[model samples]
Target: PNVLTQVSGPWKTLYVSSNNLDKIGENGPFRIYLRGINVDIPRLKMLFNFYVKVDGECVENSVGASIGRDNLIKGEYNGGNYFRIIDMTPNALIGYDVNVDSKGKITKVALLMGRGAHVNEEDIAKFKKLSREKGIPEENIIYLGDTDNCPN
Candidate 1:
């Protein structure tokens, strides 16, 4: 079996939590629908496909990050964003993103994602546990709604 085939495919954003709500809250720029992940190890980059509302219109966007050692992906998205695949299961992925904003504000983000629209409770629990350790307030966590509205 192709190794990349194991991790490259459509993904849904099940939940997102950030210490700073302005980045992941309602109408926030980072509140995006994750469409897919393309693992290009030969090129040393992984492409992330996303659908997001900009100015009340859904826009398709893609960003590429260098596949660094130790499961790190470095890219410049909002100022400078680095992603880490903290953990993953057969159908779910848990990731942490550290983003630096224009004013040099660093926002810590945790994302719970699944291969499909629905995820298991055990995975959700794991995400919550990770968020708790990361010091993200419970109120800041968001269970994304209306994923169907995004582009496929």
Candidate 2:
């Protein structure tokens, strides 16, 4: 499945406050934006087989963002918790495991091959500019993360 996202419309109209989206292919970390209350994680499963482990388990379908930011959000998409991140930091937001503060939040997004997107920096600002032109929200944009640390 293609990691999907919206570029314009509802979220921009400021009506449907929460929604869900997907990142396609680990093309690398890149910036993106999701308009909603904030960010969180729900269903996580086996996307990566060898490099990642989640929920005290390995080699099974699980989530890694045990960063404790489940259900809460930085922005919204539809009427509820439907939210999205700004984007992967462009395939490279992982700074030695893209680790978080004991899993504080999904402020950043990431992608691993067969999972979602792939993401960068300095270029982050640049990317957002283009993403906006592409109809992605400016305010809702967040930095994408690395392969080992991301929201799925």
Candidate 3:
């Protein structure tokens, strides 16, 4: 499927929303900036290159996971987690993530990403609609305006 081709390339994280505020708030472990995505269809795996701020330092990191038979990304990324690309277009994509912490706390995160750093308001509106459907509060939705401070 060209689905893999469509999503394999540079991407920027524009928005993140979560049912739990702690996951998307400042200094939150989930407040990440994406650099790009890579796919290995033969291996049924994908790699996500991103950056995270820790103690005021930008840390470069890459996450790789196998695509489960059910088409979910699964790996050792923050406790027990599975990610799915719920919706996407050539310019924009929406991802849904379910995370389980050590204490067994579950957090639902919605992400809006684009090939460009900026996307149209209509794309954002679509993301908001999906996030609301997942029960994420309006206040919890956050816009990560610019993430150019990190390394490529």
Candidate 4:
């Protein structure tokens, strides 16, 4: 008997709701491939944090990683992206929103989730220190909150 093997492609498909589909930009809300934990949550009032360096600066905000129906971040999509979500609130699963400029330099970041939450100043400072230790720029750090609710 012969067995069939499943082949994977270099890119994966991400489902964005109608609400989030309208937020895409030429360089403002881009996507990044991520592999880690704390991506899904079933509760509210939690925080999801992502750590990244933009143009050698550490971001002070929680960066968005995955596109979702709610909690959208602005970024520019391009090739060769580097960033990571260092931590998140317990029971929260999130994705990345990579921001790139015309010069191909990542300048901003955001975090996306199905629910709403906030990033405290202490957490922001912590990430900033981490970014500084890693030699990230001060202007590129970010930690965004949910301005809108994710609808399905």
Order the candidates by TM-score, highest first — what do you get? Answer: 3, 1, 4, 2
Q: Give all candidate RMSDs, comma-separated.
A: 2.3, 14.5, 1.5, 14.9
Per-residue lDDT over 55-109 for candidate 2, one digit per residue giving the tens place of the 0 to 100 score: 3232222122222244222212111122233333223211102212223432233
Best-to-worst ranking by lDDT: 3, 1, 4, 2
Model 4 per-residue lDDT tens digits across residues 70-144: 434222234333344444433232233344446765443333322223434454455555545544455544323
User: Lowest lDDT 10-mer window, candidate 2?
Assistant: 10-19
Report how far off residue 37 is in candidate 2 (Å): 32
Most accurate candidate by TM-score: 3
lDDT of each: 0.81, 0.24, 0.84, 0.31
**Weakest lDDT window of 10 consecutive positions for candidate 1:** 1-10
Give the Å shift of residue 13 in candidate 1.
0.7
lDDT for residue 23 in candidate 2, whole number 0-100: 21
Give per-residue lDDT, candidate 3, residue 48: 89
Residue 119 C-alpha lDDT in model 1: 67
Clash number for each model: 0, 55, 0, 33
| Model 1 spans with C-alpha error above 4 angstroms | 1-5, 145-148
Instruction: Tell how far residue 41 is off in model 2, in angstroms.
Output: 36
- Report the lDDT of model 2 for residue 41: 23
The TM-scores of all predictions, comma-separated, are 0.91, 0.22, 0.93, 0.32
Model 2 RMSD vs true structure: 14.5
